[PDB]
Amino acid sequence: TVAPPAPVYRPKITLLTLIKTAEHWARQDIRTIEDSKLRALLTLCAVMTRKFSKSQLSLLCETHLRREGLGQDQAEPVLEVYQRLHSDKGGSFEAALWQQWDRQSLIMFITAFLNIALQLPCESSAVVVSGLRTLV
Amino acid sequence: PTVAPPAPVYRDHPKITLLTLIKTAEHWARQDIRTIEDSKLRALLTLCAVMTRKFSKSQLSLLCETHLRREGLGQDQAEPVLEVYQRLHSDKGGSFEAALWQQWDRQSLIMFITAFLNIALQLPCESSAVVVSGLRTLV
């Protein structure tokens, strides 16, 4: 790999605002909220899923199952949602989820995600985690 | 046509979190890293690469331009700056990140890392008007 030459010297939705929004909504009862707020929460989950490394999605899936009491047979559909939100372009998969899932299924999934996302590490790589150790 | 998987079937009824990453960046943005040890500088390069990936691909242009403005760099310097951000954002197994460490001089790495840490926490991590308008009602 060849690096480029070094430089020659002659409401903002920031990472923190995203976390704060998730913390607030993880604490709320969204079972009765309006469709417009629920649609926005789906976007929040899609954006936040993309703040997890691709390799961390397996643990995210498994933590989701454990919190919800879901069986191991339910792992692939849950992992598929996370993987396809993570690789989503122009909200294509996110819109398919909104259109094809029942409201109750989306509320269950969004609540489970919001209540696990802030406690899980956003990186799974042993090299990244060991690399960052000296800085924390 | 995009087909979503079936919904889950209910039969009955220091960790590197995103907040830790932000707190680590906040702390190191305030430090003078001109004299720190190589092991801490190497770790800061990993912190920059990991954070870069917390920005959407489309937000990289604004990140590069904010970097150029803070540093007083000319517009002819935007492509190699954006190249760094684009290749850290798509990096696999730290391949591009290691090439930087190996090929750039210590001064260049210090300058780049300081500039990034001092701009990363103030920039939105999303550029899409659809995403930003979608999230508006929730903030």
Residue numbers in the entry:
A (entry chain B): 114 to 123, 140 to 265
B (entry chain A): 113 to 125, 140 to 265
Sentences from the paper on this structure:
The EBOV NP-VP30 fusion protein diffracted to 2.20 Å with ten protomers in the asymmetric unit, while the MARV NP-VP30 construct diffracted to 3.25 Å with eight protomers in the asymmetric unit. Amino acids from the EBOV NP peptide contacting VP30 are primarily those that are highly conserved across ebolaviruses. NP contacts VP30 on the EBOV VP30 globular C-terminal domain, distal to the VP30 dimer interface. The NP-VP30 interface is primarily hydrophobic. Very few NP side chains make hydrogen bonds to VP30. The NP peptide makes several hydrogen bonds using its main-chain atoms to the VP30 side chains of Q203, R213, Q229 and W230. The buried non-polar surface area calculated from the ITC experiments is 520 Å2, which is similar to the 620 Å2 of total buried surface area observed in the EBOV NP-VP30 crystal structure.
Filoviruses are unusual among mononegaviruses in that they encode an additional nucleocapsid component, VP30.
